[PDB]
């Protein structure tokens, strides 16, 4: 009658949120112990193929490293963590926000006071994982999710799923030719142009022929952009990433001096007071309205180190 043992039969299964190759992500609610019916989100991994590969046990480690170590209001919250024999199980909370980029699509395009605000909280845990010396890489839209109230979480610091997209990448990732953090800072600059535009700033037909564009590094400003968004993106877009701002030991501060970020009270936006552009509807803490359809049912399918000591339980 001591401390919950928490394994899988804790959680009952309600919806798949998406599926990887590495494993799925599901919908569960807690049915016995210290949340018993609170809603969560449940990332199963395989554990017998991440260790079949390097690169993939690393971003796995890492991950349920990051989610342990850096706690902040714009970064998804890790609750627990267990295995079993062949599988790794994260519960994390569960972002009923859904994505946010997904609402770029029934606005077409964000205004400049909309994605100011979101580019603003993003940049905060951009600037956090930089503090403690993590770089977030491969930042991308689909990563950037929205909580109950409609705030920014990042998420996705372990594996990808097929087993993605390179238009987010910046130039030095490409080239493979070494980056410190200033990457991270380009990634803000084309998924500010993406909220902005509805698009990334450079495409092409195929895998290679994209990539010669975003070399190339051509600025395609549309007239409607204020003065101020034209000058930001140009300066996170740079090709040199030492020339790029943020790059310099200034970092996220340096980013937020700009005066595009004018109006940003730094201090409530962070205490998350600053009432957020899009707002979801709630009928629920179970409402799954803005995660689509292509997800239903529900059906989870000697070296063991070193996922030894995976467990976790969130101190809160
Ligand atoms: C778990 C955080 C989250 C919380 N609440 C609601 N939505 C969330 N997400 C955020 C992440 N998002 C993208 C995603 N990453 C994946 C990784 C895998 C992997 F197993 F690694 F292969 C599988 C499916 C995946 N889908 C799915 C729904």
Redesign the pocket.
Known sequence: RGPEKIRPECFELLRV?????????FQVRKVTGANTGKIF?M???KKAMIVRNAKDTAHTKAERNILEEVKHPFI?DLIYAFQTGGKLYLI????SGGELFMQLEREGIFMEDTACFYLAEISMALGHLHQKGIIYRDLKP?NI?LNHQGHVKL??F????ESGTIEYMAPEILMRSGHNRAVDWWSLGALMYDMLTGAPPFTGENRKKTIDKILKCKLNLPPYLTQEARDLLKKLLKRNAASRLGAGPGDAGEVQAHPFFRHINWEELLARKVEPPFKPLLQSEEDVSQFDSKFTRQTPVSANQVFLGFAYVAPS
Not at 17 to 25: E, P
Not at 92 to 95: A, P, S
């Open positions: 949120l998406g599926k990887g190759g590495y494993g799925k992500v989100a990332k199963v991994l998804v994390l909370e569960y972002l689909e999710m998420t996705d372990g594996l990808c799923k």
